């Protein structure tokens, strides 16, 4: 629908870390939405960006991408140290149905919780 | 971890379609894993690939890629019609701890089910 406050739940190993996000509006330079983490001073918070494109002269197929990145600084004011980039991009043809899109979305969402990927993400162990 | 035969249940708009994946080895040419679903011909098989890159001096950063690409066929013999490319790429640093990676992965996984993204992926309506 529109941009409303999103309250994530049970995030992390223990599931005791909860994240609340308030929309920060959509910029008009290139039409990407944005979110932010409530509370803490800006430039020191989680960022979530969602964008939906349209067919172009060069890119006929659709393109929806989600970019998420968050820096964790260390100790007058905290200074950013390093970031953890993470982006997700899809691609659909104009003739594609809703069933296939939903199937891909939920399949990848479930795959991000597999033992294989939980081992391949938290630790750095290549699949072998 | 060994690339065991993963399977997916209660997947879809109504959570009814299920799929089974069998491993198809790992190729040393670029160090990427692979997964696939058993099918009549390789062309129509749903494919899932995961990989992690050694942070060489040219890049000095970690990368994790997950590429999901499944086609569909329509009817002598079926042929591929349209693709459903869907890739996921990560990035980290040498000194990044486990907490940040766990937080990023878990929030991405939980946000994929958030109603905003549910609406965005389905009807492709911009936020």
């Amino acid at each position, epitope marked *: 629908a529109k941009l409303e406050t999103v309250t994530l*739940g049970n995030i992390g190993k*223990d599931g005791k870390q909860t994240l609340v996000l308030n929309p920060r509006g959509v910029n008009p330079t290139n039409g990407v939405a944005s979110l932010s983490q409530a509370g803490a001073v800006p430039a020191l918070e989680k960022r979530v960006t969602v964008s939906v494109s349209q067919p172009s002269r060069n890119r006929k197929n659709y393109k929806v991408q989600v970019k998420i990145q968050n820096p964790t600084a260390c100790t007058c004011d905290p200074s950013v140290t390093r970031q953890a980039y993470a982006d997700v991009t899809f691609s659909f043809t104009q003739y594609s149905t809703d069933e296939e899109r939903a199937f891909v979305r939920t399949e990848l969402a479930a795959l991000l919780a597999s*033992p294989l990927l939980i081992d391949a993400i938290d630790q750095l162990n290549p699949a072998y | 971890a060994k690339l065991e*035969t993963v*399977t997916l249940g209660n997947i879809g708009k109504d959570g009814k379609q299920t799929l*089974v994946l069998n491993p198809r080895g790992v190729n040393p040419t670029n160090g990427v894993a692979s997964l696939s679903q058993a099918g009549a011909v390789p062309a129509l098989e749903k494919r899932v690939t995961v990989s992690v890159s050694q942070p060489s001096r040219n890049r000095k950063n970690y990368k994790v890629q997950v590429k999901i690409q499944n086609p569909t066929a329509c009817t002598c013999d079926p042929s591929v019609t349209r693709q459903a490319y869907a890739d996921v790429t990560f990035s980290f640093t040498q000194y990044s701890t486990d907490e940040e990676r766990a937080f990023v992965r878990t929030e991405l996984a939980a946000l994929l089910a958030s109603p905003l993204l549910i609406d965005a992926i389905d009807q492709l309506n911009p936020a």
Partner: antibody
Amino acid sequence: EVQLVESGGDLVKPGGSLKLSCAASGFTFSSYGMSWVRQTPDKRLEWVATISTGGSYTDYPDSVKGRFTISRDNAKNTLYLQMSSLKSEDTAMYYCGRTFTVPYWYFDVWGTGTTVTV
Amino acid sequence: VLTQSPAIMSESPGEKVTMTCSASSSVSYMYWYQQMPGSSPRLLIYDTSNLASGVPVRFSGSGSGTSYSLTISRMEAEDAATYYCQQWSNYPPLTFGAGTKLE
């Protein structure tokens, strides 16, 4: 789909040393996740000894960790649970379960269950 | 990690009947099973929103922060014995809940 769990588990002294077995009649057992349901005799039930497909990743609750071991083979469609040693507790009839590999939480249709007492 | 439900409710055939469960925490999902008086409990709803796997339409449930509905349809002939509960808090140790009886 007809899960069979017919095994031993007759009453034994508090020393364990017994094995539980399961079998699938027409079910495809090659690529699926299994689990065990410890149902207390009166009302409750708890979760214990769940493994994933491929016999590579296992898990246990933090109550019997390091005391219960699961061995599974793809041949003859069987799985084995090792009952090492009891504490005079857990004298309750057991259930075997089926699950997909990465909705490993929540189980699915399961057959009857056997009993074990100490 | 801790769940509870009201127990021992008697209900004549027809009209409405309901039974809920407590949370005592924040849970992403809240599933439950139906156990026949003999043996072999089955599955139903399993997603707090999806109808069921084998139960024919009548049984339904709705989700919230703590309450989880589990609203039985206007007909409940037989449908006896125990309805359990189960949650998945996105970290391993499963909990389940105490049983309940019907008539």
